[PDB]
């Protein structure tokens, strides 16, 4: 695309600059360009990709929620403008999710052989189908939800076989899968069970960790705990 003429290393460098400048749309465009170079991504590069699109779609989701709430209050006298503008933001959000899912499908996942990369990408696939499900209405809502569930489940299966229970990727996957259960799949009991089991198995493995990894793992465990406190 428009990044085809830029060096891979230059794209990564500029993604880091864009992150420092809080220019997340630029950051995502740079990382998309890096992915399209066709080489596998390092751990640091995967995190740059995730941070960029998380912030872009995060802004879209927040905007969509504001507009959706105004629209439903409008239906509890005006014309079509609120619906039109909510639809505009929704279409842009869906476009970003489709872009991320397209990168994962072409061809990040199929080249990801190590547990840390494969689980990372499958978690991302679950996440961006989950964002699609947040705005989906009706029947293809069902198929989107199942695509998220399938991606998360495959990621979970690998992480349980290949990663210790304190691994931050494994913890973040379980956190997000539990949010999927609670918010999307209308399965709060499954959400609570997953979050509790994940927390407890990580707690029993903390003794193996260095001080730095201990900090990394307990930060995500706190997120699980925060959700359980909200949910129970």
């Amino acid at each position: 695309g428009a990044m085809g003429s830029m060096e891979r290393a230059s794209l990564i460098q500029k993604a880091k600059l864009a992150e420092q400048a809080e220019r997340y749309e630029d950051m995502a465009a740079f990382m998309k360009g890096a992915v399209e170079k066709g080489e596998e991504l390092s751990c640091e590069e995967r995190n740059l990709l995730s941070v960029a699109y998380k912030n872009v779609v995060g802004g879209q989701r927040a905007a969509w929620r504001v507009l959706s709430s105004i629209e439903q209050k409008s239906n509890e006298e005006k014309g079509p403008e609120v619906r039109e503008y909510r639809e505009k933001v929704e279409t842009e959000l869906q476009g970003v999710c489709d872009t991320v899912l397209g990168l994962l499908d072409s061809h990040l996942i199929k080249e990801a052989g190590d547990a840390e990369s494969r689980v990372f990408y499958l978690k991302m696939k679950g996440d961006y189908y989950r964002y699609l499900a947040e705005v989906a209405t009706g029947d293809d809502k069902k198929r989107i939800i199942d695509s998220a569930r399938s991606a998360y489940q495959e990621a979970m299966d690998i992480s349980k076989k290949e990663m210790p229970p304190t691994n931050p990727i494994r913890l973040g996957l379980a956190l997000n899968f539990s949010v999927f259960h609670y918010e999307i799949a209308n399965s709060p009991e499954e959400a609570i069970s997953l979050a509790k089991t994940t927390f407890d198995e990580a707690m029993a493995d903390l003794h193996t960790l260095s001080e730095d990894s201990y900090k990394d793992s307990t930060l995500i465990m706190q997120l699980l705990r925060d959700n359980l406190t909200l949910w129970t």
């Binding site: 996440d127 973040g172 956190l175 949010v179 609670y182 995500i220 997120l223 925060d226 959700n227």
Partner: peptide, 5 residues
């Protein structure tokens, strides 16, 4: 309902 950072 918080998701991963």
């Amino acid at each position: 309902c918080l998701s991963d950072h």
